[PDB]
Design a protein around this ligand. Structure first.
Ligand SMILES: [Mg+2]
Ligand SMILES: [Mg+2]
Ligand SMILES: [Mg+2]
Ligand SMILES: [Mg+2]
Ligand SMILES: [Mg+2]
Ligand SMILES: [Mg+2]
Ligand SMILES: [Mg+2]
Ligand SMILES: [Mg+2]
Ligand SMILES: [Mg+2]
Ligand SMILES: [Mg+2]
Ligand SMILES: [Mg+2]
Ligand SMILES: [Mg+2]
Ligand SMILES: [Mg+2]
Ligand SMILES: [Mg+2]
Ligand SMILES: [Mg+2]
Ligand SMILES: [Mg+2]
Ligand SMILES: [Mg+2]
Ligand SMILES: [Mg+2]
Ligand SMILES: [Mg+2]
Ligand SMILES: [Mg+2]
Ligand SMILES: [Mg+2]
Ligand SMILES: [Mg+2]
Ligand SMILES: [Mg+2]
Ligand SMILES: [Mg+2]
Ligand SMILES: [Mg+2]
Ligand SMILES: [Mg+2]
Ligand SMILES: [Mg+2]
Ligand SMILES: [Mg+2]
Ligand SMILES: [Mg+2]
Ligand SMILES: [Mg+2]
Ligand SMILES: [Mg+2]
Ligand SMILES: [Mg+2]
Ligand SMILES: [Mg+2]
Ligand SMILES: [Zn+2]
Lengths: 56, 336, 138
RNA sequence: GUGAAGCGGGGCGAAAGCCCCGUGGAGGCCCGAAGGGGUUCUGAUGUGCAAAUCGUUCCCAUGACCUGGGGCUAGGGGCAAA
RNA sequence: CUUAAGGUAGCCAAAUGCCUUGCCGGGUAAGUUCCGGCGUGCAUGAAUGGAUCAACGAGGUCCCCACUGUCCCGGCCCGGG
RNA sequence: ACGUCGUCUCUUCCCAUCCUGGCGGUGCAGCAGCCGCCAAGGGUGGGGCUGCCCGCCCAUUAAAGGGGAACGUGAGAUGGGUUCAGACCGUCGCGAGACAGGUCGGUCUCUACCUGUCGGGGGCGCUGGCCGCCUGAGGGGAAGGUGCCCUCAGUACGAGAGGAACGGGGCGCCGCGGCCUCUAGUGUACCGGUUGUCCGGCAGGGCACUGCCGGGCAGCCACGCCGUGGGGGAUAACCGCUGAA
RNA sequence: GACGGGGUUGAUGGGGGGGCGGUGUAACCCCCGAGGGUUUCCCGAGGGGAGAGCCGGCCCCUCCCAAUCGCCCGAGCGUGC
């Protein structure tokens, strides 16, 4: 019952949602959805360049 | 026998896997519970959907004790049950069978009951109660006949479901009879039957899946190196030895789902009065909204998303009872 | 007697299996190992099922890449990182960027004197000797 | 696509010679359509579309190459890279 | 001595070695196959061709990297039945 | 004319029991081991080598038992070996040929008639017709099986080295039954990007068999989640009480 | 085939409005744009602002359309032990 922020889009993540991703360097990232996870990790997208993140 | 040992594929304890004879669960077993006061030993409700909740673990020996944990929960839409009749049972001396000896009905049954029953314009309840009293001294069990009120549920249908629920709680048959008679023509709400934090068994007909193959129905393996096999791979190789011939234990395709199943020891997390506090703003998918009382069960429940589900007091409760205090549901996923 | 870990081992979706090649997350000399066994009450499988392990589980490994005197030697190791996402008993879903093991003695003491990278909390709770060297615990 | 003989230029060098670049256009040469063949899936078909086929994957593809018309050799005989 | 000679150069548990998963190394966590050696070789050997692999191979085989629904272990979808 | 090895798949049965349950003996101190008896409810797995079967071996494991079913099961598969026609070697034979010696290659046919089995329907009967709620003769079940850690306790035992147990607490693995909230897969509903060409250009669109690529609701689903027990009775091997002949 | 729900005394399917959600910000308009030219009012891949736009085999509300008109099955009687 502690609310985190998506590491990509910045939205609140209610409990029981999303994944916690641990980078090789030890940094813990949280993502609200698979859409934000693949954008941030697999496809290396820039959150500032995505309109749906900018206007969220 | 087998070249390499392994357990059989699927259970033969649910043979035959036929469609349930009725869409309403028919409960075979009702426990003997000592509550100190008379009460119904079960309730019936409609399965609305599933959510997840943040619940504080209250098991002192549990490794997660005192922590907030996320649990999947099932929401039941539970409008009050309407008590239409009282039936008495005795034991037939010839064989020991339980046999109904009579029943007394409410004088003016609701008009929706006429959709399922052939009723008179008026029941003469006082005569029926008088006749019933003659069998009091041979009574061993008393049950009420309840009708659901689906108009008060999110389904909105009109035809009710009718079933018997016994009265228990005290060992004295007479007080159970007196309590059952006092219920004639009244409604019963879930809070009259259960208390939050207790365990219940659930009985329902499971979700239907139609005709299914042996791979899905019994879990037999797809033939390994699947492309090699002429005449298909979603099958058993052989269907038996030379003798005995096709046995009833051989996995075969057929109806899958729409069976009655019983699951044990599901904890009631919350019994609410108004379902607007648990209904998601989008509504329950494929169900609708809950406007009256509801039951929040921990875990999953058999049945499709509008099935009528029977809850009863547990028949195989664990040795250690759950804590007396109500469980602390911090947050439910349908809320902000 | 030695310090005890937690008595419990909750279900974890296994990430590595027989003949998986896993990097080593310590300074014991080994760099890459082949998984050849799973150790414990959870190692037992059924017909055709390949045994597998998750974070916190102990495995049997063979050194494939590393120092010349450790090559082809059989050791025990603890899974500390896992790419396969797994659900913690509190309901949190966790995944790592890579798989990793740490070489230990059969009693659970690490062979090397340092552990590189983050270590799953399942590993540190079950094996207190690993908890001692884990700089970052997640 | 490769780039034989042959033919230019440049560089090193004492002579011989060696090296780089170009030109040239050889070969039962290479990749690959047409065409020819017929390897795998032991695929489909297997009361077939078919008394030998279809898909796929393949082998050759300037030559001991593929192909039309005409002609010759006939049964204890023919013809056979067999 | 026996039907003449008496297996030379080489080559080998060979597509040729029964015994035999021969013995010793390599490679694997584990190799009845494979590779490298060994050889009184059941029953190897010189145009009956011996040795021999550059180039070539829809030939038969082993190892390594990459790769993957082959598998762990099954799921959902599309067209035609 | 009964398809010839093995394997795959799938079901069941036996017990002469490998583990799990019970008990006893021991040259049983403990930890282990060895031997016998009852007992077939459940388990008996993953790999390397070889066409195998068998066997040897590797890492685990409570243990990784053995047999029968037309050497269970090719109108279910597979086709590596054996065991056709081509070919090579060694050996034998004057020769053509031969070898259960090695070796390379070498078509696995059938629209299911009956019965069986699995599921799904129509009727007649149930002593006039019908509706609703019940009962329970019988039938099926493995619906559960089995490990680990802490405490007990570095205690009993023991010269030491070593080193238990009952009870109590926690959690898995395998199986079974559900479920779709989470996560994962899909998602030719849907939205977007973009290649070639065609519709004069823009916009919108056809085709490239969703053109390709990315995301993805519902649904389905497992790689996800939930449930999956103790008790009573008579007994087996036997251990005892009282107790005569 | 069956089963379950509704059938006007009605929210059963559709339409319309709202909720919730997927994708990713349409059109139009304004600004920036490497540079070039009818010289700085033109071309120009693209970037920014406001507005998203499209869509839902889900939920609610609302009788606007359709759940109509119709076609059938059906016990009734005797007899004996
Ligand atoms: Mg085949
Ligand atoms: Mg050529
Ligand atoms: Mg063939
Ligand atoms: Mg074929
Ligand atoms: Mg056919
Ligand atoms: Mg070619
Ligand atoms: Mg010699
Ligand atoms: Mg040679
Ligand atoms: Mg030799
Ligand atoms: Mg050889
Ligand atoms: Mg010789
Ligand atoms: Mg020769
Ligand atoms: Mg010779
Ligand atoms: Mg030669
Ligand atoms: Mg050739
Ligand atoms: Mg015959
Ligand atoms: Mg036959
Ligand atoms: Mg025959
Ligand atoms: Mg016996
Ligand atoms: Mg046989
Ligand atoms: Mg056959
Ligand atoms: Mg047969
Ligand atoms: Mg063969
Ligand atoms: Mg052969
Ligand atoms: Mg042969
Ligand atoms: Mg001769
Ligand atoms: Mg057939
Ligand atoms: Mg029984
Ligand atoms: Mg299941
Ligand atoms: Mg997609
Ligand atoms: Mg355009
Ligand atoms: Mg066109
Ligand atoms: Mg198209
Ligand atoms: Zn996000």
């Amino acid at each position: 019952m502690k609310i985190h922020k998506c590491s990509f889009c910045g939205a609140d993540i209610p409990p029981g949602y999303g994944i916690m991703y641990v980078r090789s360097d030890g940094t813990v990232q949280r993502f609200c959805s698979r859409k934000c996870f693949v954008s941030a990790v697999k496809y290396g997208r820039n959150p500032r360049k995505l309109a749906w993140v900018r206007k969220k | 026998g087998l070249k390499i040992n392994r357990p059989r594929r699927g259970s033969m304890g649910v043979y035959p896997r036929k469609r349930a004879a009725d869409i309403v669960p028919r409960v075979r077993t009702w426990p003997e519970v000592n509550l100190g006061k008379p009460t119904l030993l079960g309730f019936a409700a409609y399965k609305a959907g599933m959510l997840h909740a943040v619940v504080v673990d209250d098991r002192p020996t549990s490794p997660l004790y005192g922590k907030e944990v996320v649990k999947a929960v099932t929401v039941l839409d539970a409008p009050p049950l309407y008590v239409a009749a009282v039936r008495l049972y005795t034991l037939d001396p010839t064989n020991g069978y339980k046999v109904a000896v009579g029943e007394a009905w409410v004088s003016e049954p609701p008009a929706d009951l006429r959709r399922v029953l052939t009723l008179p314009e008026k029941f003469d309840t006082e005569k029926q109660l008088k006749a019933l009293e003659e069998y009091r001294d041979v009574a061993v069990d008393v049950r009420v006949l309840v009708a659901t009120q689906p108009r008060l549920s999110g389904i909105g249908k009109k035809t009710p479901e009718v079933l018997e629920i016994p009265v228990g709680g005290v060992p004295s048959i007479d007080e159970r009879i007196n309590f059952a008679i006092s219920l004639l023509g009244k409604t019963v709400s879930p809070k009259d039957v259960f208390t939050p934090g207790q365990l219940v068994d659930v009985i329902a007909v499971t979700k239907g899946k139609g005709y299914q193959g042996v791979v899905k129905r019994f879990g037999v393996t797809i033939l390994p190196r699947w492309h090699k096999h002429r005449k298909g791979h979603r099958r058993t190789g052989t269907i038996g030895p030379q003798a005995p011939a096709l046995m009833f234990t051989q996995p075969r395709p057929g109806q899958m789902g729409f069976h009655q199943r019983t699951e044990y020891n599901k904890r009631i997390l919350k019994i609410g009065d108004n379902g607007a506090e648990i209904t998601p703003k989008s509504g329950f998918p494929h169900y609708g909204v809950i406007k009256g009382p509801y039951i929040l069960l921990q875990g999953s429940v058999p049945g499709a998303r509008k099935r009528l589900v029977v809850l009863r007091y547990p028949v195989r409760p664990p040795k250690k009872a759950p804590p007396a205090a109500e469980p602390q549901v911090v947050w439910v996923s349908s809320q902000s | 007697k030695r310090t005890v870990g937690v008595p419990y081992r909750f279900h974890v979706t296994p990430g590595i299996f027989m003949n998986s090649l896993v990097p080593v997350a310590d300074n014991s000399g080994a760099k890459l190992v082949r998984v050849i066994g799973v150790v414990g009450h959870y190692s037992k499988s059924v017909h055709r099922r390949i045994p597998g392990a998750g974070v916190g589980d102990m495995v049997v490994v063979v050194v494939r890449e590393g120092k010349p005197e450790l090559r082809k030697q059989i050791f025990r190791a603890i899974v500390v990182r896992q790419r396969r996402p797994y659900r913690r008993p509190d309901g949190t879903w966790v995944a790592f960027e890579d798989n990793a093991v740490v070489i230990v003695t059969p009693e659970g003491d690490p062979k090397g004197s340092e552990i590189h990278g983050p270590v799953a909390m399942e590993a540190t709770l079950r094996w207190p000797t690993i908890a001692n060297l884990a700089s970052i615990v997640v």
